[PDB]
Design a protein around this ligand. Structure first.
Ligand SMILES: OC[C@H]1O[C@@H](O[C@H]2[C@H](O)[C@@H](O)[C@H](O[C@@H]3[C@@H](O)[C@@H](O)O[C@H](CO)[C@H]3O)O[C@@H]2CO)[C@H](O)[C@@H](O)[C@@H]1O
Ligand SMILES: [Ca+2]
Length: 250
């Protein structure tokens, strides 16, 4: 419903303004990522089945130049925020550490596969005041591992949820790295894989928050949900590998 078909590349007049190359093995860098544990006791949205474990290397660890977000079948019943979940996973975001208004975002990633796995790379507005989905949301990459070659790119607004999205295919996305990218300006968003936009969403320039809520900063989110849109017990453990995040601006 938001088709695109054009090349995408880091413009020559843009600079790298922030990156996690994941050069440093161990815990993610607390200056760049926080853990989101906020709905662990209550259960996450979308009828999701995962517990998101914070400072737990079995779920979130930097290893051989990659962020590793790993889902496991275990019950983390010793955690004070445990919510009876049958699976653990990771969710990191830049919320309250780094956000961006416009930019070329590049995430190079090998995905987490298995029926139930729902790896994502997505953004939400730092200003949450208008609520969901009015605040505006950008899914650079969504995949559901019962359809594991298909890459989804979508935006969420008050007027559109009407959802504006598109899809493409990539070669063994869980067994090789691709670059999932967003090119966001005041005029439009492209979302692509490997230098090709398969998704285009234009600003109608009508100054209407319901249709263009993207004249304000967004933060970035990395996670593997389990269930919802994504359960094969044999598929665990499974992991998303992020080689780098790079953000460029004029
Ligand atoms: O249900 C009302 C609550 O919504 C919270 O927002 C959630 C929303 O409910 C949920 O459907 C949604 O899920 C995401 C998809 O929209 C898409 O962006 O891809 C994501 C990654 O796969 C997926 O998680 O996420 C929203 C944000 O957590 C509100 O935050 C809450 O205030 C409200 O009561
Ligand atoms: Ca790296």
């Amino acid at each position: 419903t938001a088709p695109g078909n054009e090349p995408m590349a880091i413009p020559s007049d843009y600079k790298l303004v922030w990156a996690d190359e994941f050069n440093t093995p161990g815990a993610p860098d607390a200056k760049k990522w926080r853990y989101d544990t906020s709905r662990n006791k209550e259960g996450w949205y979308n009828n999701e089945l995962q517990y998101y474990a914070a400072g737990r290397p079995e779920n979130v660890r930097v290893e051989n130049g990659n962020l590793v977000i790993e889902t496991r079948k275990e019950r983390l019943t010793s955690m004070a925020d445990y919510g009876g979940q049958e699976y653990s996973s990771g969710k990191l975001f830049t919320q309250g550490l780094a956000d961006w208004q416009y930019g070329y975002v590049e995430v190079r990633a090998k995905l987490a596969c298995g029926k139930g796995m729902w790896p994502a790379i997505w953004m939400m507005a730092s200003d949450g005041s208008t609520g969901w989905p009015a605040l505006g949301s950008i899914d650079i990459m969504e995949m559901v591992a019962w359809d594991p070659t298909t890459i989804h790119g979508t935006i969420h607004t008050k007027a559109y949820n009407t959802q504006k999205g598109s899809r493409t295919t990539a070669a063994d996305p869980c067994g090789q790295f691709h670059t999932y990218s967003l090119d966001w300006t005041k005029d439009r968003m492209l979302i692509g894989v490997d230098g090709h936009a398969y998704m285009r969403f234009d600003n109608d320039h009508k100054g209407n928050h319901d249709t263009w809520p993207f004249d304000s900063p967004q933060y970035l989110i990395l996670n593997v949900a389990i269930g919802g849109w994504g359960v094969d017990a044999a598929a665990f453990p499974s992991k998303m590998e992020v080689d780098y995040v790079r953000v460029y601006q004029k």
